[model samples]
Target: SMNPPPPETSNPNKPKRQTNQLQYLLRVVLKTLWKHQFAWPFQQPVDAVKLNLPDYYKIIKTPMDMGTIKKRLENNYYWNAQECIQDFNTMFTNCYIYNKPGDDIVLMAEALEKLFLQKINELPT
Candidate 1:
């Protein structure tokens, strides 16, 4: 008869680890958003050879490119985990400014915050 399988490794004490991972993810997301928002005023031209963004906004005459962002994240950060967070921030900011909506700016900020937090919760743990 086979010996009983080795006692299973229990990570029952891993709640803290999970919590730390969640916090780390949030920090990464916030940092990406902060960097992108701060760079908006400069309109600093991203190196075309380094990054290639999709032409999703081309029809609207907006020059946003997802590929450039991917390149920047890969070349600069060594991690691709925060790509979605950056994209979400870009979309939220652009939508708030360009999309005609009656909501006040404060309300819009709150809505964006709520949506971001919800998205964070939905991300894989």
Candidate 2:
């Protein structure tokens, strides 16, 4: 009898990508923050001229925002959740420092921080 056809050396269909669960969860939370009503200010870098804050860049030496954080996550810039959380805190601190205590932007930052903290704490310990 003739020999049968040789078996395939490799798999025709490759295995699907299995993303990290923690990373996936964090992405979800990040998206939620982006969609928040108060996310406008934190969506991008502050505009010194448009906002008329002549010395904004001078005082807020290190600027941060949700859009920047999103890019960092996509680029794998943060090694862990702590690093990402640090960026979030930095953004809030910047807002607190620049805007007055009773300003709407300050209030929004506080609200956003609360929402973020509550969502972040829900992650598995």
**TM-score: which candidate is best?**
2
Q: How far off is residue 35 in model 2, in Å?
A: 0.5
Cα deviation at 43, candidate 1, in Å, is: 26
Model 1 lDDT per residue over 1-125, tens place: 11222222233433322343344444554444444533342133223334342332332233232343433443333233454455545645654554357655335544545645765775666
List pairs with backbone clashes in candidate 1.
52-67, 52-68, 53-65, 53-66, 53-67, 53-68
lDDT over C-alpha atoms for residue 32 of model 1: 43
User: For candidate 2, lDDT tens digit of each residue in 13-100?
Assistant: 5443323534753566788889999899888777677777887777876778787788766655555677678788899999999889
lDDT of 1 at 113: 54
What's every prediction's RMSD, in angstroms? 18.2, 16.2
Best by lDDT: 2
